[PDB]
Amino acid sequence: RPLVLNHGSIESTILIPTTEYHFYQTLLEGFRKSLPQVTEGFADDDEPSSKAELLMKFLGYIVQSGVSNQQEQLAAAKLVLNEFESRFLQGLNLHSYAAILLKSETFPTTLLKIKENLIKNYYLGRALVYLPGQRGLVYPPSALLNAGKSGSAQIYAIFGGQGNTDDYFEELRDIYHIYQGLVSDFVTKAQLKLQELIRTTPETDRIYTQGLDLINWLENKDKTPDQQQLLSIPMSCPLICVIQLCHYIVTCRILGITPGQLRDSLKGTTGHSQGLVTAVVVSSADSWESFEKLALQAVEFMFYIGVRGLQTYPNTSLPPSIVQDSEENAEGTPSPMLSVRDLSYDQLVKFVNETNQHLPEAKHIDISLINGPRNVVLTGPPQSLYGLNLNLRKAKAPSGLDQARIPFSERKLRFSNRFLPIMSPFHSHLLSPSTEKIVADLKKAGVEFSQSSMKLPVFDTYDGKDLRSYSGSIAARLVECITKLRVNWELSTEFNSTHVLDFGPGGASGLGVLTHRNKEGTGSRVIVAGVLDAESEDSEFGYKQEIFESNEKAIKYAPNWLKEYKPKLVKTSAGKIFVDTKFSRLLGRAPLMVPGMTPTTVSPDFVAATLNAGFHTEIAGGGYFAPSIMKAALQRVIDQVTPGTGVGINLIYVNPRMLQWGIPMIKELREQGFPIQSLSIGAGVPSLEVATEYIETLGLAHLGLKPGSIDAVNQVITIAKAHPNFPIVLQWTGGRGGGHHSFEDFHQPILQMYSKIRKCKNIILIAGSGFGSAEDTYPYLTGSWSHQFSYPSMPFDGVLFGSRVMTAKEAKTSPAAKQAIADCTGVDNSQWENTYKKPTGGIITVRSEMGEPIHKIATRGVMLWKELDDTIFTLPKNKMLEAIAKKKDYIIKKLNA
């Protein structure tokens, strides 16, 4: 017989009890009033919004509101549990089913609804049924950890430290709330490890004022100390270590495995500063009792670091004109750790040195840990760290400096420094007096780790070496790595990883997303392993639902850019080798093209000459002024080229007059049938609405775009993401190499926008800016151009040759002007910015007709063009005429000669 448990607008949830339904009728009559009334679309958080959220909080009713005997509470719970584990989720487990339940349009549930109604009530039913948990293998085969155990999916564990979040205790409150049955054997024995063995018997104690009743604070948020007693080091160092081990206990209990059964499925397992202690207990755990005997040692370890680290550098209060100044100039409270981000290391080594010289030896600022090439934190006294915060404030650019329409003239840098939420100077001279006090105190108890019962490696944070092959006391080395030694995170994590697990105390702000850009395009998906948050549309970091998956084919990987966009070769069955590139697949030709250049690709006799050579080109629209003459010039390409080949069209965006005829002429040519296959829009990206009249209405095969700035590259992506099926070709040309500028460095914006570009899998990325030979552009096809910036391989899809093509045989430039190009000598990719001062081998920049820094060969006409820009042409209305009148006799001799 069936049974209904409806609520408002969902009646569908039907369980099938036995025919003895007197108990089930008196069961749900309290449940029918136990749940709140309907919020006009299920907007309340205590109110079920799906078909399964009614069945699970019905199970949560009949376990928590236990009125009958235990014989029928146990039977009814495993009846709701079995109808749920065989109809809603089958095969796949709970959070993987909760992953697809959160991104459900037909039932708009949220995260606090899905964790309170569904996730929490399930493990209550898994608690009164199967009470120890020693039997009943219903646990699904997690395919990520199965592939890491044997396969090409090697897993690495990462443990966070301190300063990721300021309210770290609301993470321990959250994991004790949802997983209350799982993490309670450990938290009640870690509380009775701290307060019962080492807080009642230290040498002295006035630093724990409110006590350490941990269990009472988790269920009562009015008994919790507020945010500054908790951030204090005596009860932040053990409590962060409890959070990481609770994330390791929970993950080992969703899967129903031992800690030594998750251990063989990975390798690596390092930690940052505080989590390197958690990194040893994970690598040396064997069973569920070898873990707990060893996890309590890591709590007793971090108790002595927090207690003795406060007795050698106690917390201090700053002047409130210092605190209010830093808090309103976009930083935090002045703390002993300040994080400088997006600044190069050789600049902040002298910003610290120019502040350290006006200071004593004790009040020095040390670079305590290097998380990346543009991500360090500094550590000194908090009043001394406010020192170089004022020094850095005078070398910072405001929000409207605009070194994007202005070249590199101002020396204002675009970075950001903020104080970390850490209350002690870790990895500095200020805490290193508290080392021999700790080693002689860890030797009083048995808090020496074994150094040979750890089977995974553990990479040191100072020098990156493994801690298994380390002579000496490994517990005495761990206090060295926290108190005094610099964390060198780049060579501490120089492993080869396909997936990276972060059991951090930050969650979406821990070590995963912090050091994410450090290993961006080398194929290592970082998985935050403490928070669910199934909304993950972008693919830069995963979530806890990716630890476990039933099928092997739902493992999301990370974009190894070298492996995907590697240039290969293909040979046709006639002996013609191509270079297999994403741009070369689009044209069926070589990956190298010639753009629409105004004086030299205007002639149809030359455009047809480089189309018969088997390369792509485009006849420029700048040298045409009416659609009849241009259509007769496009036709003149088609006569002297073999049938089946196409042309491109380069139209310039900064005159609407050319787009008055040019965009209709392409439309009238395409619907009548004409081999025009492409359209590039030079000197500016069109907006998104006017762009889709070019994709949809015109019959083009691929759209060319030349973004100059870094917002235009973002503007191209909004055109590409609007429709992912059209080949939007991105032609990147920097400041060098071109006839015009992009006003910026060439490979600085694509060093930041390569990850955003390659997520759009229809954008074809083409490098420009002055290439002229095979060895010149071979680092750009393969990706070995970004190796000189400590960046991964970022390979291009083809390149394009501009000014190198101008001295060709079929080019209609004059032979006296061809040799004037050859006698002009070129510069490297670095010193191109001295063009607006001196001739760089014979090339300067002048203003354009509308005013653009246009590149020209420094001839006597351009030197006169340059001189009149800086003496007459950049004057006001009134002052121009007398400067004309003063130098009228002088100008005329220059014009005639």
Binding site: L586, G588, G644, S803, T807, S814, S848, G861
Partner: protein, 259 residues
């Protein structure tokens, strides 16, 4: 400033126009990088650009193919190929019974882009170049591909590929239902070599016998952007020969030499 900087780019092209043919008064645009090698002047464009292309090919052979040309992934023609790896099309009844592939599309609308992948798959022959081509060349005229219209998956349609996973002897034949019976609507085969014959057949005629509209195409693997070209030298009679036998009988001979 109007008379000075305006229409000043063409003097580099012909400098007979400028005063005394002085090159130092002109304006030649040139970027600062890439000027230190250009001593070879008046070089053909097939040598300036292939030597960059051959210089890349020579550098990839020794690098990722260990200096061996025998490890190159040999293809028939070269163009883009899209991924439809798993055969999970929505409404189909694919069976492969000893070189005969019947593909009765059952219901609804299938993915058309997935349908033409099944229709010519797992090789790089003339058939994949015909069904998956994005362009047809009508004699220097890029038009839409006819195979996306004569083989668009409608309801109750059925194609039968003979040995498309064997050789050049492939005979694709689409059947469709008129009056409750399957009639041979579309046929497709490779007559000769580098020549494709597509014949669309109509069964409801004057003398109640089916006539076929023979349309022939070229196939060059040397171009991959547009590998299919319709021959047009004689197709206007090929349509008039078709419509003669369809409007009038097949008894009366096809007469085009009227006055």
């Amino acid at each position: 400033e109007f008379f000075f900087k305006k229409d000043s780019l063409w003097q580099s092209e012909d400098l007979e126009a400028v005063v005394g043919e002085d090159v130092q008064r002109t304006c030649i645009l040139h970027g600062p990088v890439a000027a230190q090698f250009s001593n070879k002047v008046d070089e053909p464009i097939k040598d300036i650009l292939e030597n960059i292309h051959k210089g890349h090919i020579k550098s990839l052979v020794k690098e990722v193919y260990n200096g061996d040309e025998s490890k190159i992934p040999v293809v028939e023609y070269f163009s883009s190929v899209d991924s439809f790896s798993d055969t999970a099309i929505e409404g189909v009844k694919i069976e492969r019974s000893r070189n005969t592939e019947t593909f009765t599309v059952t219901s609804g609308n299938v993915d058309n882009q997935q349908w033409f992948d099944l229709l010519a798959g797992k090789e790089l022959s003339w058939r994949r170049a015909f069904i998956t081509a994005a362009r047809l060349v009508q004699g220097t005229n890029f038009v839409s591909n006819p195979a996306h219209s004569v083989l668009a998956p409608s309801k109750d349609l059925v194609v039968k590929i003979e040995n498309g996973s064997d050789a050049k002897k492939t005979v694709l034949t689409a059947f469709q239902r008129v009056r409750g019976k399957y009639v041979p609507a579309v046929s497709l085969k490779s007559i000769g070599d580098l020549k494709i014959k597509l014949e669309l057949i109509e069964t409801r005629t004057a003398d109640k016998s089916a006539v076929a509209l023979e349309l022939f195409y070229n196939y060059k693997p040397t171009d991959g952007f547009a590998p299919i070209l319709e021959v047009m030298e004689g197709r206007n009679t090929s349509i008039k020969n078709f419509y003669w036998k369809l409007w009038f009988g097949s008894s009366v001979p096809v007469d085009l030499d009227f006055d």
